[PDB]
Design an enzyme around this catalytic site. Structure first.
Site, PDB file in Angstrom:
ATOM      1  N   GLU A  35       0.779  -1.083   0.068  1.00 31.12           N
ATOM      2  CA  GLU A  35       0.025  -0.032   0.069  1.00 31.12           C
ATOM      3  C   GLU A  35       0.825   1.395  -0.055  1.00 31.12           C
ATOM      4  OE1 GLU A  35      -3.393   0.484   0.027  1.00 31.12           O
ATOM      5  OE2 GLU A  35      -3.979  -1.350   0.076  1.00 31.12           O
ATOM      6  N   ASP A  44      -9.316   9.737  -3.816  1.00 30.76           N
ATOM      7  CA  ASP A  44      -8.865   8.559  -4.673  1.00 30.76           C
ATOM      8  C   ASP A  44      -9.486   8.734  -6.235  1.00 30.76           C
ATOM      9  OD1 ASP A  44     -11.142   7.569  -4.106  1.00 30.76           O
ATOM     10  OD2 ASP A  44     -10.749   5.825  -3.240  1.00 30.76           O
TER      11      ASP A  44
END
Lengths: 165, 165
Positions: A35, A44
């Site tokens: 991640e 996002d």
């Protein structure tokens, strides 16, 4: 997997599935894992607000600069949640490596997806090697296969099958 | 420690770190370990309801009598939680003795205190002797050093340093 990441996962083993997953996500240095990390909140690609090690929720302060320690606290809570969401559905004893790798998988892919996956059914039938292989099938997003996912899936696979060889 | 307990530690060593900690907490009888036992909620000195060997949640019934059975359920769960909350923070390999010693310590002082601690820093720099010695710094509360905490940390320490002889 990289040798530092491998050693990292090795030392986490005594700490169980949660710790294993935490190494997968944050990586050895705590900032070089599967991640991304981000100290300042951002929307996002699906327009969901996100910060730290991929953390989303109603608790994100948009004007805040988060510390490394805050980021790690929030991951801990989120992983505990993943565990809560999926462990009920795993009807068989699996090793900590396998469990940790499925946490990391589910963190990325979501609890629904997992519940109805073939991967789970192969887990529940005792087909561990076959469950770990199902991971490779989870590299597709927007009808494109992603190099980043294929790599992630390979690394989660190694750990999933860690006990076997 | 007391020989009654030094033995009972060793008794559940092969049970692993959880079982080592769970021992230190209950002792062989159930009251004669490091935590205070009580089958009805009492408000502690800082005004938090507490039951069994130190269990605090929002899941507490104010007139209820708890069983020796229901208190084992609460502890095991509570100790699962401690392991979840602290292991990801532990980046090195450590003896189940040591780990179990730390589970007990954090039971007492809390995950926050632990995550910011010098002790964890020594742990992660490989310095286990140095780590366990740091237990001794955790013997104050409300101005004062307490003889009861001084004991409790020597015990936790002894178990922490079981590997090194």
């Amino acid at each position: 997997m990289p040798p530092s990441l491998r050693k990292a996962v090795a030392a986490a083993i005594g700490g169980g599935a949660i710790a294993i997953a935490s190494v997968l996500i944050t990586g050895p240095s705590g900032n070089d894992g599967l991640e991304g990390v981000s100290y300042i909140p951002y929307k996002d690609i699906v327009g969901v607000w996100t910060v730290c090690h991929g953390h989303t929720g109603k608790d994100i302060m948009l004007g805040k600069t988060y510390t490394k320690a805050e980021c790690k606290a929030l991951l801990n809570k989120d992983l505990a949640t993943v565990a809560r969401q999926i462990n009920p559905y795993i009807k068989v004893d699996i090793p900590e490596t396998t469990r940790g790798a499925l946490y990391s998988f589910v963190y990325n892919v979501g609890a629904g997806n997992f519940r109805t996956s073939t991967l789970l059914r192969k887990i529940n039938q005792g087909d561990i090697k076959g469950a770990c292989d199902q991971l490779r099938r989870w590299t597709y997003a927007g009808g494109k296969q992603w190099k980043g996912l294929m790599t992630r899936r390979e690394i989660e696979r190694e750990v999933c099958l860690w006990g076997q060889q």
